[PDB]
Amino acid sequence: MDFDVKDFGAKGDGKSDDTEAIQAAIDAAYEAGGGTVRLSAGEYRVSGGDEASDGALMIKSNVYMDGAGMGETVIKLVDGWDQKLTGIIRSKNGEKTHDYGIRDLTLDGNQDNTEGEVDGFYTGYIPREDGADYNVTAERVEIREVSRYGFDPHEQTINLTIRDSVAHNNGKDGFVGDFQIDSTFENNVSHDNGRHGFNIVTSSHDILLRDNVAYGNGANGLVVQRGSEDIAHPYNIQIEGGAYHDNGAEGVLIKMTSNASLQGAEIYGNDAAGVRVRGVDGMQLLDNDIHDNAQGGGKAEIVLEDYDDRDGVSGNYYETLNATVQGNRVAGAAQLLSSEGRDLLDGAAGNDLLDGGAGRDTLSGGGGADTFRFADRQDSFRNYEGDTSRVDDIVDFTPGADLIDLSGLGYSGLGDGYNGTLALLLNEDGTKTYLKDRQADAQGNHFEIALDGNLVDSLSATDIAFDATQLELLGTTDLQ
Ligand SMILES: [Ca+2]
Ligand SMILES: [Ca+2]
Ligand SMILES: [Ca+2]
Ligand SMILES: [Ca+2]
Ligand SMILES: [Ca+2]
Ligand SMILES: [Ca+2]
Secondary structure, three states: OEEEEHHOOOOOOEEEEHHHHHHHHHHHHHHHHOEEEEEOOOOEEOOOOOHHHOOOOOOOOOOOEEEOOOOOOOEEEEOOOOOOOEEEEEEEOOOOOOEEEEEEEEEEEOHHHHOOOOOEEEEOOOOOOOOOOOEEEEEEEEEOOOOOOEEOOOOOOOEEEEEEEEEEEOOOEEEEEEEEEEEEEEOOOOEEOOOOOEEEEEOOOOEEEEEEEEEEEOOOOEEOOOOOOOOOOOOEEEEEOOOOOOOOOOEEEEEEEEEEEEEOOOOEOOOOOOOEEEOEEEEEEOEEEEEOOOOOOOOOOOOOOEEOOOOOOOOEEOOOOOEEEOOOOOOEEEEEEEEOOOEEEOOOOOOOEEEEOOOOOEOOOOOOOOOOEEHHHHOOEOOOOOOOOOOEEOOOOOOOOOEEEEEEEOOOOOEEEOOOEEEEEEEOOEEEEEEEEOOOOOOOOEEEEEEEOOOOOOOOHEEEOOOHHHHHHHHHOOOO
């Protein structure tokens, strides 16, 4: 049913310590088997316990707390607190707390008049052990002025939902999803935090980040990452819609993650790249609107690259792989580099650099002057002993504007296709033009590229860089 904190002695006056009163309301609601702890408008001061892991208030299974609205019900930390406090509202470590939530209320960490690391909302069970909180909701909650992490749901929580909420002016990250599972962050705003807007980390997976907005943060608008430990990477991370703008680092940064997707977002005004992808296995970058990034310097609106952790905790080298980059509007350069397996890589209006690496890739540059790089003869080839597969195709090569960068491959020029020359050929129905090495290597492979369309007469020697000197003369981008 309903429990009003005032009926348990809570004053809501901005000066009395209401911790024990609100906690009494919570314990009564839990002992009845579940209930709504109700708080009328006011500022309720709260204080911590003997240890950081006590937090301030302990929410419990089947208890929901409903305020009078963001800005109207404010739970605020007392002046003078000088001890690390991990969760102004939190569940208990070492207990599987479930079917609880907070709505229509503000948590104020009062960093101006306190010292020590404070987190707003903390969930989860026990780091490095199996077990989870589950069915956790925060609706229309505002978390502000904590010295560290605003929303800090933590390892492990399953079916966390945070919606229609706001984190601002927190000392580090507005939102952390630490080992969250099968969870949802929707229509939230995270702004003017000391470091990240949203930070999904520590093995989190099956996460939907829909229509969130992040601006004015000291670092990334959104970062999805493994973290500093040698643990399972996050995976199945779907970012849909929303806006990541005017941040101190990249708009969206994804690193050491598997099967991530970023679609339909507006990404602008960031100091670093709009989107940066580092060592991501399965990346979809679809239908975004990306402009005016790299305000702090830098040559690229989009960066795909590897993540070399060989000298770090895992000892591993992580390629970006399995990438699909399509339908984006990109007012500046895209660096689209991938590796083994089939990549679909589309540039936009900028002067882009495209290289699908090993396997059979489909590349398009769009407008501007783009460089399609082929770094190894085994990255686009045909073996007649078996399939034409493994031959890359360029969709829209534009003679006079685009460039084919073969500068590392050791061919001398166009010719009959032997002796280190490449032959320019048209297939039978005139739908594809090939550059071909007619000399098989020892495995029977022929370096070969397809250009979609008929370019046997339009293409010329100045469209291909055959060595580093030519590449310096002809290169179309700042990115090499
Ligand atoms: Ca718990
Ligand atoms: Ca302080
Ligand atoms: Ca590839
Ligand atoms: Ca382009
Ligand atoms: Ca182009
Ligand atoms: Ca390739």
